[PDB]
């Protein structure tokens, strides 16, 4: 009762799917290899970090990113699959934003990178919509009671990034220095940028 179905090893099933399609000529040469490279090397949270560092030092870009995120990202050439309609959401001293896909895994791939295993977990998908303060605390981020937490559930085609607040102690830093402290988890919204 409630037992799992018999299944061949998942690697054998996944490669069987590839071979069945490739043997019928339906997969172009180097097609899946091309995607592997895109996913590993092009889609990257270092792009979102670059965007945040620019917004932190250029008020006019900051306004563009917050009102027409797509157009802002396009200036850098970072639009792409699962990142064609971008909305950046701004943290403030009274608001902390956090992103999830409760129904699956939806993520702004080209500027955040593919989602990490924990973001696709059932734990995060079930819990952060209902108890984001406790989830962030468990993850190592304390959010005070008089800060509103706002959870964006990515249920359609909008693809989000968080614009975190710029931490004190970074005055006069270069965009390179700033980008270094903006991590993937800062862009998802579960972490706040850290100053040494």
């Amino acid at each position: 009762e409630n037992a799992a179905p018999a299944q061949a090893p998942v690697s054998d099933r996944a490669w069987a799917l590839f071979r069945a399609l490739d043997g019928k000529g339906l997969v172009p040469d180097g097609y899946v290899e091309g995607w592997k490279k895109t996913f590993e090397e092009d889609f990257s949270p270092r792009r979102g970090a670059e965007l945040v560092a620019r917004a932190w030092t250029d008020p006019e870009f900051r306004q563009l990113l917050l009102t027409d995120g797509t157009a802002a990202v396009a200036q850098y050439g970072y639009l792409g699959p699962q990142g064609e309609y971008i909305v950046a959401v701004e943290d403030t001293p009274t608001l902390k934003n956090v992103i999830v896909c409760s129904l699956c895994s939806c993520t702004a791939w080209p500027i955040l990178g593919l989602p990490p295993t924990w973001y696709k977990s059932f734990e995060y998908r079930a819990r952060v919509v209902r108890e984001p303060r406790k989830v962030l605390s468990e993850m190592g981020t304390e959010i005070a009671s008089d800060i509103e937490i706002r959870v964006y559930d990515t249920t359609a085609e909008t693809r989000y990034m968080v614009l975190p607040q710029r931490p004190a102690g970074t005055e006069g830093w270069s965009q390179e220095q700033l980008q270094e402290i903006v991590t993937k988890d800062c862009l998802i919204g579960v972490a706040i940028p850290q100053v040494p």
């Binding site: 099933r13 996944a14 924990w118």
Partner: protein
């Protein structure tokens, strides 16, 4: 579809397996793991055989216990294989011959889907809206926690997309609709049993009505 995939709000899970900025390892943790997404895009863009919405729905159609014990990327192997068989491109028999053993697929759909709604409203930022109190057995991009609930429009998209409840079934009547960032108070969704502030759900126009 009121499937087990609609996890927001479910109680009883433990800690998220992550602390901030911890090592997440490489993009792919096994040499097969890029295949599900890559073969999804082959199906969408090279073969024209199905939509991304049809991939979300076929994963929703995994048998519920099967969904719950299957790792993420393996669910999409199963889903894309399922669509290739349903669309007539592959047979389960040849998948199993190649795989050297059983390759159970998602369950058949129990709904034909539904068209983009004929009567909808264009909402403005600031307006109060209610999520339509409707039950859809096929694909829908409305998590049940917001069904029937009231929130405020924070954004109307400047682009439009096919209605998921139709294109997720491969129908010809998905039309196009914008979506709305609808902000709900936490208390509206979970009463006293929440520690949050607000939740913004990105809802197709056809899921909404004036409050």
């Amino acid at each position: 579809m009121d499937g087990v995939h609609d996890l927001a709000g479910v109680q009883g899970f433990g800690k998220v397996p992550h602390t901030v900025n911890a090592d997440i390892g490489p993009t792919f943790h096994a040499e097969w793991e890029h295949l599900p997404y890559s073969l999804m895009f082959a199906g969408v863009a090279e073969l024209g055989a199905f939509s991304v919405d049809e991939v979300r729905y076929v994963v929703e159609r995994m048998e519920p216990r099967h969904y719950m014990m299957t790792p993420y990327y393996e669910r999409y192997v199963i889903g894309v294989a399922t669509l290739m068989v349903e669309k007539g491109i592959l047979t389960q028999d040849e998948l199993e011959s190649l795989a050297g053993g059983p390759f159970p697929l998602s369950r058949p759909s129990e709904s034909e889907g539904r068209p983009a709604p004929v009567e909808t409203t264009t909402f403005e930022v600031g307006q109060r809206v209610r999520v339509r109190d409707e039950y859809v057995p096929g694909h829908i991009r409305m998590p049940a926690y917001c069904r029937g609930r009231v929130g405020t429009i924070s954004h109307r998209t400047t682009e439009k997309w096919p209605f998921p409840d139709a294109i997720g079934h491969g129908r010809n009547d998905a039309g196009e609709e914008p979506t709305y960032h609808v902000k709900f108070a936490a208390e509206e969704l979970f009463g006293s049993d929440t520690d949050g502030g607000s939740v913004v759900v990105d809802l197709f126009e056809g899921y909404l009505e004036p409050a």
